[PDB]
Design a protein around this nucleic acid. Structure first.
Lengths: 155, 95, 66
RNA sequence: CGCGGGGUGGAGCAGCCGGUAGCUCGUCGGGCUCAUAACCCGAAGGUCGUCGGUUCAAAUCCGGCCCCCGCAACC
RNA sequence: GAUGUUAGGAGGGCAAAUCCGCCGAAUUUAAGCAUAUAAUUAAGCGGAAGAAAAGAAAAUAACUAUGAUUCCUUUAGUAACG
RNA sequence: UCUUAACCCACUCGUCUUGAAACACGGACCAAGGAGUCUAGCAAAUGUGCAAGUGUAUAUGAUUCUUUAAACAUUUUACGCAUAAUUAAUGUAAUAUGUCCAUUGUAGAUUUGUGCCCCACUUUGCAUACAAUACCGGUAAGCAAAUGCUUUAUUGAGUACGAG
RNA sequence: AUACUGACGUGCAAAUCGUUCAUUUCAAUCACGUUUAGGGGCGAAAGACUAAUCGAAAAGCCUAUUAGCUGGUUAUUUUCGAAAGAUCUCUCAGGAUCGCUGGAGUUGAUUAAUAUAAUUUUACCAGGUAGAGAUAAUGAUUAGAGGACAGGGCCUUGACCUAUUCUCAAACUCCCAAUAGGUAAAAAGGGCGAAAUAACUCAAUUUGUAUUUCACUCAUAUUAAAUAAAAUAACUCCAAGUGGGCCAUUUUUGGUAAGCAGAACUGGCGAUGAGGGAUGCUCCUAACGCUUGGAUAAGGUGCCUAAAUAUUCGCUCAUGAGAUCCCAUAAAAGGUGUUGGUUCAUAUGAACUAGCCCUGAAAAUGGAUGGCGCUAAAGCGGAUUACCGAUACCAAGCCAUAAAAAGAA
RNA sequence: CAAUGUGAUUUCUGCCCAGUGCUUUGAAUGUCAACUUGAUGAAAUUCAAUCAAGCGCAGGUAAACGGCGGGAGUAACUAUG
RNA sequence: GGAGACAUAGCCAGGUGGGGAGUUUGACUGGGGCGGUACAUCUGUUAAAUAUUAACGCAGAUGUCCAAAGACAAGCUCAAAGAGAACAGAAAUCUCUUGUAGACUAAAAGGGGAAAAGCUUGUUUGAUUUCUAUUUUCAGAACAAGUAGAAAACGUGAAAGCGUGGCCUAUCGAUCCUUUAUAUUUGCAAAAUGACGUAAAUUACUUACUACUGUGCAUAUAGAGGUGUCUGAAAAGUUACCACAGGGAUAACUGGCUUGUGGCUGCCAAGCGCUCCUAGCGACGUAGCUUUUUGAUCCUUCGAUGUCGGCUCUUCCUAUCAUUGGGACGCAGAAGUCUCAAAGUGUCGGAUUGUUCACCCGCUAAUAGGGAACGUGAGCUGGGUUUAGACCGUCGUGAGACAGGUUAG
RNA sequence: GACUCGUUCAUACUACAGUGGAUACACCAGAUCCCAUCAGAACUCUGAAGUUAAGCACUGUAAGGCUUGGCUAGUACUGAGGUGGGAGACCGCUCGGGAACACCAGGUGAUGAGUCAG
């Protein structure tokens, strides 16, 4: 309690090492808008549309964009319930999220696998691997490549 | 805190354009004897008994918000403008 | 003597007792907070689409019915 | 909140009565007596609290504040 | 205006549920309390009747108006007061 | 069934209390009496009757006059609440055909069909949810010779073929 | 009515009795008659007295005054079953509103799946605590060395530079975890296309946008990573109780410390017990309809007291031995008591080391490994088996509840 | 007569009127109400004005309530002052 | 006779007025009061690497200030160091060179900030009107503080752009009430108040047509005047004369935990002890024991466990004061000291005190230290602390207060 | 060969040296006009005389820094478990996860779009 806005300055709001005034051209230009997921990250430079403490490093969907503002739907736990909150943030604060990129790459790769299978009229599964239990194997070992271990005396 | 005595600004009445306004300090009217609440206060007070109507004997604040009365010089109509609580106010002084 | 100060005890367990609820409004985010001008342009488009649709629907129903 | 009054050398206080601001005290020096001293002089010294104006001349009168302490209503 | 054991008469007092007059509080309520509330009530002193009181317009309306009183149903927990 | 035995277990009940066998409190014993009710006004629930109405109020009527202090009837077109709302308030108060018709979506109960039954396609699309537009009262803004208007804003216990 | 604080103190008595003492011709004592009445009287004053009644009498009424406070609050079976957090409060013995609870309804569930999940997977993130650092910065902070201005008397002492150097902080941060936490995993959607709609956009009413209509088509016989008595889920309503908490491990702040004050995460207790811990609210095992049988858990197996005077290898003698988590003391320091080691020296001399055992080791009714006892242990450290051992667990019966089947000669 | 205080004799009863009281003077006096009077306005109203006590100013009062500090400088030693 | 339209009396009105009346006299609080404010807030830390989080935790800060220290543009680079210039070496200077921020950014601490958010300058007033979606605190209400926009009108650069106050985290207030802004919007309840306005008509009680109409009051909307016990009572003392409702949710008493403090025992070895570390000692350190002191404490008891001391009377301990047996000695003898087994036995008469304690005198064998509900009030006593009467002092306007003294209970 | 716009924002930095200047960059030349300052220093404008001396390009140096990797180290540290050990402080063990500094070795950039001259 006794809780003003930016409390925990030395914690979260502390800048990344040697990162001052970073404002280069590529930062702005991403454009996926109303469907997109987006991370909310603090910028050392920009104080103007800085979020509240809780929203740091969190991710949520963009629901509205303006000139250099972004509305973001973020989940917050409020005691007994997780609820969706309309977080207004700025363009400098929003970072494009990468979860979508994992889904998309998998969709593209699977689609290529599906397309290949379809051309052959094959019956095969495009589902992800489980990283299952290792099968049987073989190695040939000369006396030179095998080392005898034992515990160590104090030294 | 110091304001000049004129301001060219938006009038919210008739003239849409930015135009000159005179700036002065409001300081609260003297109370009427004809106000309905004052009549009620008089009625309640009259005859035997005490009173409740506005009094406070333990005051906290030494300060007042200043509200400026702005008079449009074009259309002859007035507007209020409110600004920060001050101990110290100055009019027209400059530096 | 003193009354209690911090304690947050049992509250997490109570939350998990009735389960930690999550929203379920889902589709079609709505009304006033929608983008000025652009959504009015969409309303005009929708009204246009609706007029073309209504013209098709009225003609098609009327010709068959009678 | 609306009425009355006081701010003047380091201290006490006259001038507020528009023709030009002083007088005590304490200080600082000097006469006077064969004495000490008391007494009597000469010095220093102040944005007349801050600000706007009336003419021949304004600390003083008109205009309005600030700091002080008296009356009050409110109750 | 007196005076009269003048002649003929009356009033007084008791009882009180309902009725009428004065006079007239506090507990209480507001989680306190001083205004408001309790309450024009309780107590107090008076007067009546089988019922009394009210009653024949110095009334209400603003209608195509109604037309002594009482009472019920109502307006109405409303206008309104605080 | 009652009765001792013997083995094993068994600390005063009620109580407020974090914690009572307590060096916490009430209880000598027994009997009888002895404590969430009734009225008012409000609410949801469910039953029940009727429905855009509903409730016969006060009251009148009778071959009603042991019961009958209720039961029965309503003249050989009052009032409550609901039938559109809004609002300081004068006030104002259409989703419109210019086949009784004609609000838009997406899910969604139910129905049609196909290829002696589940089906997989289609088909129709209630309720409800999630929206969407209108339009009505307030309030803006813009205009303004008023059946005051207006693209556009907002706001209401609003409305979109009555539910009480 | 002074004292014996005498007797009495369930009396002879709601102030008595005994003894002592003060008062006695006056501001004397006593009667009778009389006066003043309750916020009133009367008071040589003590808040005295006013009919056993007085810092506001007695009587009756308003009155069944009021009370966040105390006590009490009545038949049975069965079912679900809590809170002692929070927020606002002239608020800390309360209230309100959230939470957590029950009922009632609706929704959709029955298709071994989708919604869904105190979980992991693979992607994807967020961190500056544990840690670590001083030669990275900050605050510290101990030393010398190598150098070109200062203090003292060409020397010495310094400061100052440079390479170094010692110790540091959880209120410092170059770097930096684990744990815990967030987003992600396709059919009401997504692909790639065409056509439509606009008052947005852009020279560009198909430039983009968004929307829409048509298409063509994405795994899914089971699957778009696992796993799931995943619908016992949702959702709406109405109402209850509760708002003092307390205990344990780990992390932890204050305080010398505390069975002290205050937390964090989780689990308990409370409201809940059976078996063990001699004993015991919280430790361990384990949560309970009624019964029979089984096999075990924690825990034990000399006797009390149910199972082994079991087996097997050690260690241990104590003129206060020692005996099992929570658990109810014992340290620094010693020991030519015994037992293992290890480093050294020349089957002998040193030095260490840690096991046991001992000294160090004092206290209030008599006294406590729970008691007796126990030393070829029944002690302490292992290991090997057997046996006993809960209402839990398995099998069976029976009871009720829940759900599912299933039915209108 | 009423209201008080101190409490035989003997003996003395200092100082102080700022503060709080009580009390006295006022052709100088600051403030201070109802009414009344006048002004203003079409009226309602709104304003002025006046010779109340009172308080204030100015005195008197301690056998009224009451109260009774701090420094410096200073005596042929130290010391005290 | 006397006084006399003045008195007086009545009714208004101001004053005086604890004589009398009615009432108020917070909360947090390691009891309460005093004290503080942890009561509205903001920063860092405590905080246990998302978020949450407290204590009379720690380090603090708040009730402002700012026509610029607000706004935009443009230009510039600071603290410091060295080397130069008669003045700043050494009271706020001048130049060049080196200079990653070591400056500066009103305050308050932390964040952020170098072709700038610093500094300089120019031009300025958006410190604007209207409206949302929202975020912080949060019930996901308010207010307050924010964020992203939008409808206007502008400002600045004019070039993109940026501007809805202050670089960010801190700088503040409901309803009723008061007050002033605003309107082609309203009301004051059977009617009217600009105005016979504008037309016509006139044998008149004429007929049309007009968007903007008396004082006063009431609204509606918008600010502001205030609530710091900061979701907002018009509020002082005192009771040892007291009453009542409750309280071991809370003091004073034992007990209990703890044992800081008190008390007692250690280990060490620098010194002291003629010489000599240890006969006797023992600093500077470091380890325990006890509850014989006082705390810390608030678990127990508040529908009563009788609150000191003395007396009497008994029992238990040992940490032994003397007595017995001894060991050591710096023990010549005589003394005497340290000490071990030892609780078998003893441990007094008085003076002064309310007194534990204390302090003397005398004897003595020594006049040891302690436990038993601080041994012992249905054993006593009642002197003290501690009911009501009274007294003096201080303090308090007062009532009264006084772990101040005193007398009586 | 060079430049312009860039991108990543030190492999891109810094220091001391050396090598290179067709076209290009820059240093350089001047102040009437546009402009700007006390000051043509800078800034603006107009030139094009000289020059690699610097900037600029490139390399070098028991360079410093930065930067990857090893190694520090399965150490330090750490979740859950334990009627495990330890008188206490604490320390093992089961199932798991797991650093940092120092030190050593390597490295000192890559690249989109456009242009101009060879």
């Amino acid at each position: 309690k006794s809780r003003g806005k930016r409390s925990g300055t030395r914690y979260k709001f502390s800048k990344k090492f040697r990162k001052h005034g970073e404002c280069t051209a590529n930062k702005y230009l991403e454009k996926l808008n109303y469907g997109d997921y987006v991370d909310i990250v603090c910028d050392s430079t920009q104080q103007k549309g800085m979020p509240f403490n809780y929203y740091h490093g969190k991710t949520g969907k963009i629901f509205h964009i303006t000139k250099r503002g972004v509305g973001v739907l973020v989940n917050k736990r409020v005691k007994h319930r997780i609820e969706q909150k309309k977080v207004c943030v700025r363009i400098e604060h929003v970072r494009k999220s990468r979860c979508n990129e994992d889904f998309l790459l998998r969709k593209i790769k699977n689609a290529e696998l599906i397309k290949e299978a379809k051309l052959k009229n094959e019956h095969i599964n495009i589902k992800r691997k489980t990283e299952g239990p290792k099968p049987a194997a073989m190695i040939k070992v000369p006396p030179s490549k095998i080392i005898t271990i034992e515990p160590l005396p104090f030294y | 805190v110091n304001v000049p005595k004129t301001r060219k600004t938006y009038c919210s009445n008739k003239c849409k354009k930015h135009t000159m306004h005179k700036v002065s300090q409001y300081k609260k009217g003297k109370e009427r004897l004809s106000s309905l609440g004052r009549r009620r206060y008089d009625m309640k007070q009259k005859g035997f008994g005490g009173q409740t109507k506005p009094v406070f004997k333990k005051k906290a604040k030494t300060t007042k918000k200043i509200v400026l009365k702005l008079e449009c010089t074009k259309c002859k109509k007035k507007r209020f403008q409110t600004m920060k609580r001050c101990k110290t106010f100055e009019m027209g002084a400059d530096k | 003597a003193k009354s209690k100060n911090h304690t947050n005890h049992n509250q997490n367990r109570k939350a998990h007792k009735n389960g930690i609820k999550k929203p379920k409004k889902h589709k079609f985010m709505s009304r006033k907070g929608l983008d000025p001008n652009f959504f009015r342009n969409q309303k005009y488009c929708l009204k246009g689409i609706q007029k073309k649709k209504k013209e098709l629907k009225l003609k098609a129903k009327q010709e068959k019915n009678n």
